[PDB]
Amino acid sequence: RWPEYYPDIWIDSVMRQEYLWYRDMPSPAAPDYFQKPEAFLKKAVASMDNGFSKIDSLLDEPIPSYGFDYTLYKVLDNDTAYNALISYVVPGSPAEEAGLQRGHWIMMMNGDYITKKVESELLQGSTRQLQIGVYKEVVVTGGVVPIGETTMPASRSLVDKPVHRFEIIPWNGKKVGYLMYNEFKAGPTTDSQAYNDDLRRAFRDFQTGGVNEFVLDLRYNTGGSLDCAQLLCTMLAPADKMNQLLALLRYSDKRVEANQDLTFNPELIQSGANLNLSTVYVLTTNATRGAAEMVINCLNPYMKVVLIGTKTAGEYVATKPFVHPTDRFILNLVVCNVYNAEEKSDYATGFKPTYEYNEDSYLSTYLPFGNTNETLLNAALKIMSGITD
Numbered sequence: 001r002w003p004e005y006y007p008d009i010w011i012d013s014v015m016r017q018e019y020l021w022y023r024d025m026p027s028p029a030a031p032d033y034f035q036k037p038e039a040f041l042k043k044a045v046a047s048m049d050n051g052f053s054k055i056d057s058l059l060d061e062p063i064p065s066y067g068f069d070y071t072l073y074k075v076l077d078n079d080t081a082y083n084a085l086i087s088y089v090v091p092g093s094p095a096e097e098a099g100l101q102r103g104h105w106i107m108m109m110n111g112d113y114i115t116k117k118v119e120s121e122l123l124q125g126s127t128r129q130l131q132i133g134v135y136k137e138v139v140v141t142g143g144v145v146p147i148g149e150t151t152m153p154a155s156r157s158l159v160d161k162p163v164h165r166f167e168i169i170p171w172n173g174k175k176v177g178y179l180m181y182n183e184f185k186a187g188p189t190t191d192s193q194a195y196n197d198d199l200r201r202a203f204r205d206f207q208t209g210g211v212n213e214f215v216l217d218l219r220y221n222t223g224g225s226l227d228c229a230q231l232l233c234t235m236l237a238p239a240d241k242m243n244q245l246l247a248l249l250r251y252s253d254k255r256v257e258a259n260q261d262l263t264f265n266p267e268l269i270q271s272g273a274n275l276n277l278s279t280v281y282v283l284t285t286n287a288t289r290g291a292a293e294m295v296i297n298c299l300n301p302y303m304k305v306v307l308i309g310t311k312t313a314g315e316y317v318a319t320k321p322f323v324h325p326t327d328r329f330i331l332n333l334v335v336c337n338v339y340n341a342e343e344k345s346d347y348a349t350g351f352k353p354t355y356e357y358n359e360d361s362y363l364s365t366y367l368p369f370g371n372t373n374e375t376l377l378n379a380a381l382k383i384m385s386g387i388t389d
């Protein structure tokens with residue numbers, strides 16, 4: 001109706017220049033200078049963009065937190081109450097100092113139940129007193145039973161490292177490398193390789209230990225950098241694949257200059273080690289996304305990749321970050337296709353697992369990462385040994 005806008009908004013410009021699917025954006029509508037970037041984005045993306053592109057805030061530091069992730073389960077006959085099952089504890093966090101571990105359940109906070117009203121108090125706050133429990137079975141009935149209490153310090157701004165857990169497991173005559181790798185991130189700062197060097201260090205330890213089987217746990221890995229992914233692949237692959245094509249990054253017809261052919265590149269190994277493996281077991285959930293899915297797609301043609309868990313996210317294109325000049329947000333925009341050596345990325349809707357295991361259905365084996373009875377790792381160990389068909 002009104003106003004009558006005259007015939008310059010950054011987000012529209014960065015997208016029309018850099019977006020993989022710029023040709024499939026809606027036609028230039030009437031400008032809306034007050035709309036949130038989120039709202040602009042949702043209306044401007046191509047229909048193929050199923051939440052791949054997204055807006056993220058530019059923060060001075062990570063939002064403070066206690067350092068744990070969880071899932072709520074309704075309490076026995078309490079109307080408003082829930083128990084919080086811990087799924088991940090950040091190293092060096094208040095949660096870890098509290099003595100908390102994956103598989104612990106938070107049952108009370110300072111003598112009060114956890115209700116939907118107070119759920120956000122699990123994310124951050126002051127020092128808290130917690131009643132903690134564990135899932136127990138009795139012969140068969142199961143439930144969360146209290147086992148004790150602890151004091152959790154106040155939340156604080158935390159940095160979580162991608163190399164989350166490491167182990168070498170001897171198992172039925174095999175030497176099994178286990179890696180819980182949670183984010184494709186090279187280092188804490190813009191040009192740091194610190195985490196990639198942590199990854200190399202783990203692979204050097206794996207080679208020293210003579211690992212000949214491998215379980216890569218990407219279950220909560222939401223993605224990140226393809227250069228991290230190239231490094232990881234290069235170190236898992238069979239040794240006769242060095243220098244072969246791994247990934248074909250293909251941008252739009254306006255950004256041909258950016259196209260790249262990534263190989264299994266042995267000069268990337270540096271202080272790490274190639275493990276010369278023929279099979280890899282990859283643990284997945286719906287959270288497993290992007291770069292994490294690229295690893296699966298790109299290793300598929302070259303080795304036996306066995307997927308255990310639940311279907312992956314389906315993010316078959318790569319995003320790159322673009323920072324607004326003044327408004328402090330980041331546009332994570334789809335910029336390229338990422339084909340494997342067979343010229344394919346045909347996992348729209350996600351990679352279906354080879355063997356489906358929902359970790360939430362097996363509460364008695366919801367255990368710390370790397371414990372061999374932990375559901376998804378146990379499955380892999382059984383499958384490689386022929387215990388599970």
Ligand SMILES: [Cl-]
Pocket residue numbers: 087088089090101102369
């Ligand atoms: Cl953990």
